[PDB]
Design a protein around this ligand. Structure first.
Ligand SMILES: *[C@H](C(=O)N[C@H](C(=O)N1CCC[C@H]1C(=O)O)[C@@H](C)CC)[C@@H](O)C(=O)OCC
Lengths: 205, 47
């Protein structure tokens, strides 16, 4: 068990540098804020775990479940530089800083080495209509219209029936895709998956 | 490099690697990929 870094804290307090909160942002800038300003703890919606738990309730992301459906993009919550009541210590004391941040070269070999040496990385890819419908297997865009960019966490790789892939975690809850995860084609910068990878080293060491 | 890798196995001592979040109705995926990978790395490099 270890520190769960607060999506809320970064999303709400980064600002201009990172983009426009709930309406888009820059991951490279996000990693950079972590190095400069650091980030506090904070769990999932209504969990009361951490300094700043996520404040936007979960929903059904293009799947059927019991949760209310997702309704596009709402209001970026404000930046509250204080922890939830019932949590200690303070927000300043609760910050975790990154030592550095850096892009990872557009080589599947270089992305693979990075993950292997240092852990999971963040990357971005282009979501097409046919991606929404993903349940399992290895995703490979065929049909659909370009929908927009999507930032994710790449945590591994492998081969499923001759098809190489990246093991990727989405943030659309557990009832989407393969328990919230998905595999997407590896080695061809498919949908630009290898082209926008960013990572960094914890200040702790 | 091995033909396969899954950080959930290489580092079972880090629960966050297996953890999936929900961004909700907000285009914050840019911040989600970041804090998730940062939670992982903090554990991998220390606690
Ligand atoms: C990140 C982002 O969140 N993108 C969107 C998304 O995944 N959404 C919107 C909120 C609900 C969820 C959905 O179920 O659709 C959407 C545009 C993906 C197709 C994105 O805005 C960003 O900042 O990425 C640039 C790196």
């Amino acid at each position: 068990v270890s520190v769960e870094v607060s999506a809320e804290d970064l999303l709400t307090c980064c600002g201009s540098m990172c983009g426009d909160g709930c309406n888009g942002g820059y991951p490279a800038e996000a990693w950079n804020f972590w190095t400069r300003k650091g980030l506090v703890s904070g769990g999932l919606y209504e969990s009361h775990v951490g300094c700043r738990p996520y404040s936007i309730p979960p929903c059904e992301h293009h799947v059927n479940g019991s949760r209310p459906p997702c309704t596009g993009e709402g209001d970026t919550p404000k930046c509250s530089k204080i922890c939830e009541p019932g949590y200690s210590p303070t927000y300043k004391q609760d910050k975790h800083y990154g030592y550095n941040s850096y892009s990872v070269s557009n080589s599947e070999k270089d992305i693979m080495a990075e993950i292997y040496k240092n852990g999971p990385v963040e990357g971005a890819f282009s979501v097409y209509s046919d991606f929404l419908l993903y349940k399992s297997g290895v995703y490979q865009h065929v049909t659909g219209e370009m929908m927009g960019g999507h930032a994710i966490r790449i945590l591994g790789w492998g081969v499923e029936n001759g098809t190489p892939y990246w093991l990727v975690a989405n943030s659309w809850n557990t009832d989407w895709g393969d328990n919230g995860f998905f595999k997407i084609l590896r080695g061809q910068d498919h949908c630009g998956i290898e082209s926008e990878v960013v990572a960094g080293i914890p200040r702790t060491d | 490099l091995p033909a396969s890798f899954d950080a959930r196995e290489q580092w079972p001592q880090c629960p966050t690697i297996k953890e999936i979040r929900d961004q909700g109705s907000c285009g914050s995926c840019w911040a989600f990929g970041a804090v998730e990978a940062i939670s992982d790395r903090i554990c991998i490099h220390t606690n």
